């Protein structure tokens, strides 16, 4: 159940971040709106930047650096 | 950052104590065997020490045998310098 | 008090490396390498890092610079410093600060690479269910698999013992 | 005899006694009578992060038991 | 005799020799290996059910599959 | 590209130059070699951490124990040098000419 | 210096070289280079003069920085496409610094400054074991990671190494430095033909190690260091001199004699590639490094120097050493001319 | 409340050390036939507070290195009570026993720095010998630590306080416990393992905080009590009482026995402990694989 | 070059069983017992085809099965399960030797009524 | 010389230290496990030159997996565009906490 909730939540963050990118890059040249960097269409594990970009400190430090120097 | 805060507080308290203190007023070759002998046995300690993290596996006979070979090799080295007047003075 | 903490600890790491690679008296150099190993162990523990960096810390800052200070103390005194050390330290700080500027307020500087300019909280794993803390079982190998490796390592250690005693007048 | 020294030994023991009792009182005060969830592994940490996620306060200790179903 | 010449060394050789030999006879070697093997760290995946194997129950309460009981039986 | 790797490689190059250029004593150059050892240790270790190359994690500890006994041999040689001379100079070595 | 302890250290030399041979993992190759260093250090300083002290110190520093640069190249290799196979690599920078580390290892004209120094102030058995095994060690490495090397590196190393071994060598008076400079030139040769056919490199390794074993066995047969004692060994023993004649002319590589065969086959499979001026310039340098061979043979066997007596007193006494295997290896090393299709031994 | 946790940790160390000094002086006085200090001050607590402020008053290398040695000793003495599992430890460190050992090695560093700092004397050569007799025991202590945690799963030390509460660990290994005790005698650097200068009070402080650290860790390691939860005061009282009794026993052994000869010390260490340590440790390896009880690391 | 397609919130508007993990760990054996037969549909789907955006409707299936199980334990026996999780709540990291008596009482509850 | 003790005496002393897809003590992958398996099965029966001619697709895929070089390049381009248009000062962002 935790696996299912995690997958639904990271897909929700991906949908919201594609909404972010559809908002922000309306004037850039080039840039197909949904480029995966790779070639073969398979599911890749995200890199925590695609999950949490433009968060500015708080939630990224909680979700990444909290286990590292907490308890 | 918890350990960083503790390190900061202890360092600043140590500096406050030291500033209160000080602002309110030819060798032997036989010495050399000890350090390198210590360091090589510390290296074989570093080889031995990942055993209690390891002791839950399937191949237990291989673990036990290589553990025996490690302690027996350390014993061979220690008995070598023991018989060959190494740690003497 | 900002996000680029791994980057800043790497900066102080390079600072300490310059601080003893400017060739001081060797006990001051050992002091600088102790500080450099401390901040580097802080770096590897801040990647977490909870096992291995503190694990081999006892061998490096628990075993090495003690014996370096030992063999430095019983060798000579070097009681006089020179302008060359200070000039080399200023040139090292020049290279450091110039890289800091052309990375922080710019995009990239390439020796032969493409260094993307940002502090790297990413990349990082997405909280995947280890439950065994991968470093732990990782170094807790060598006993179900590592047959040959511990044999040749102990062989080299035995030979190191007999080599040291022979050269220092075996038997 | 030792009758004169054991009160001083007891005062030294109280100075040894005090940081554990003070620390445990701050532990039990820091979570509303609860203990800190001692996260050691990545699984325990993800468990604690969903705990602080589902509580709504972004604070794990409330733990909102069973009254979120309907 | 040979004993009190270098006594702690001889005692160390004796206890080390029994530490070497004692794995060659024990009533708990295979028990040790089975208890260590019977602890699931990696998660057991399911699979496409089978082609009618004489194993693998649906509910894990059903004792048809190979399971342990000597964990409780000392 | 993990930007910290840039400055750790720069730190390697600085430690390499501190190994090679040295004027007064062998202990300084050998200590810069030990710092270079530490640099390779830390760099490969952060590689294995952020790459999750969890199978063969033998590299940092085994690299350090082997280059440790290398350094022990180096200290043996420096003690021999200081014994057969008065100092441990880069100089006083013009004998056995080239 | 117990013989049991020396048999142990010889076993470690063998074991380190075989770990260099057989291990497909990079860490074990680095461990093998280290263990071979750690074993070859107490072979030297068999005496206790400061000469061997300084020699082992210099060799220790060179081999140590070679090992460290190799570990650097491996760590960069896994920063890029990362696999622990000894295969065709995937970086010009990592292969670049790796070939530079191997040039530190086996000696090139950038990196030859330690060689006559470390080979002068040591006994000759130590020089034999270091030359044979420390030039046999990188050949497995190059033989397995040839397909990802920029050729300009090894080519510049080879050209410059053979011309430094040609120029440096016409002035020296010590036999040890002569053999050291010859080792420099021939390792430049045996590295030069890597990226075209390693068969010539390995067969030249065989022939050169046989030649050096015969040469140093002859110089074990008389505790000599200069040409003067060589003329005295003429005046006490004639057959040693014709051995010096034939072996030195084979080191010259002359076509009736066996040393020309590794040269000539290298020229063949280097000039079936249509570069000509580079092989003939290298062969001009191979002409150039024969002068000191020839004047050495002059001062030993063909000219006759006057001598001091008590060699009359020596004449009652035999040359009663035991050799490891001198005469068999000598007639293998010299009369091996019609065995040219024994090139096919490899694959 | 984290800085208040820091305050509750590092404020009582000063009162703890000063009262330890009065306790050891009074107990030496009663091991001898000496009542006192009891004249000036009720049972002599004013006597250590006047010792501290007096040694601060009575004050007149390479000023950098001269400061770098005692600052390192004192910051280790401060920062090394963190993973102590008095019932709820301060930071629940995943591994702290090798952290203990590495910071003991850093204490050896600070001693070597002061030994260089003692300004070019046969005194400093004796200080180098003191460094040698200090460093000659971290082998044996670490290998004994490896054996006594080999029955304990991992370094996590709360699983250790789980394993201890059934039966004490003194009964699975009493001679290994005594050998570790002798190793702590040698590492704490007091009688009979002697010997060998400012600031004297701060160096005094660092050594006694080292000894209290080792005493609390010893009382942790080889004994315990039944730990009833939701009242830490029970285990705190009982653990404090037994740490008091262990420290009193340690001073009580520090009182009454003559010192060793240096070559007797080294010869004794290597050729009496070290094969015996190896045999006990290979026996601790071979035991749980034959008794089907290996500890379940989580 | 290759762009992707990611599903919308059209299927990611689903209520969750947002309880704490301590009470869920307290309900480990029982939730694994009656339910969690068709969540191995989701498990098999994921470990064969490693795609999330593939097996999500079975994520809804296991979510509504857990919701069914939680309503069943809420309405039916009993109330001192609340006592059980608030007993096992403050024990740091939870074991099962910790709160054994109320575990036995909850056993007697679930055995006698269901 | 590449001797064949490894392929002859059968003892695979180093056929587990080499890459992944061997059995970990706790069976977990790394970040590029499928890319490893695909690249290795592309370059199995291949003489390493038409590997460079043909398996370049999976080679570049594996390298951009192992580094995320162009991934962080695109992400930094996103960050620079975000920085310059928030210097412009538009749409106080509802990507976070709100809508
Ligand atoms: C005097 C040097 C003579 C070199 C041997 C003769 C020779 O081939 O010279 C031509 C060589 C090279 O000329 P070449 O023979 O390579 O001419 C080009 C021929 N094809 C295109 C078939 C390769 O000259 C030198 O090497 C320079 C002297």
Author numbering:
A (entry chain AM): 73 to 143
B (entry chain D3): 1 to 25, 50 to 113
C (entry chain D6): 1 to 80, 85 to 175
D (entry chain A1): 1 to 70
E (entry chain A3): 10 to 83
F (entry chain 4L): 1 to 98
G (entry chain D2): 1 to 347
H (entry chain D1): 1 to 60, 66 to 201, 217 to 318
Manuscript text:
The ETC is composed of four large membrane protein complexes: (1) a H+-pumping NADH-coenzyme Q (CoQ; ubiquinone) oxidoreductase (complex [C]I), (2) a succinate-CoQ oxidoreductase (CII), (3) an obligatorily dimeric H+-pumping CoQH2 (reduced CoQ; ubiquinol)-cytochrome c (cyt c) oxidoreductase (CIII2; cytochrome bc1 complex), and (4) a H+-pumping cyt c oxidase (CIV) responsible for O2 reduction. CI is an ∼1 MDa membrane protein complex with 45 protein subunits arranged into two “arms”: a peripheral arm that extends into the mitochondrial matrix and a membrane arm that is embedded in the IMM (Hirst, 2013, Sazanov, 2015). In mammalian heart mitochondria, the majority of CI is found in association with CIII2 and CIV (SC I+III2+IV; respirasome) or in association with CIII2 alone (SC I+III2). Here, we report the isolation of functional SC I+III2 from ovine heart mitochondria.
Initial 3D classification identified four classes of SC I+III2 particles. These differed mainly in the relative angles between the CI peripheral arm and membrane arm and in the angle between CI and CIII2. The assignment of the closed state was based on clear density adjacent to the CI Q-tunnel for the NDUFS2 β1-β2 loop (residues Gly52–Gly60) and for the ND3 TM helix 1 (TMH1)-TMH2 loop (residues Pro25–Lys54). In all other classes of SC I+III2, these loops were disordered, suggesting that they are distinct forms of the open state (or deactive form) of CI (Blaza et al., 2018, Fiedorczuk et al., 2016). We identified striking changes in TMH3 of ND6 between the open- and closed-state structures. Whereas in the closed state, ND6 TMH3 was a clear α-helix (residues Leu52–Met74), in each of the open states, the helix was interrupted by a π-bulge midway across the membrane (residues Tyr60–Met65). The ordered ND3 TMH1-TMH2 loop in the closed state crosses directly above ND6 TMH3. This loop, however, was disordered in the open states. Additional large conformational changes were seen in this area: the short three-stranded β sheet of NDUFS2 that harbors the β1-β2 loop was adjacent to ND6 TMH3 in the closed state but rotated away from TMH3 by as much as 10 Å in the open states. Surprisingly, the CIII2 MT-CYB that is in close contact with CI showed lower overall resolution in the SC class containing closed CI than in those with open CI.
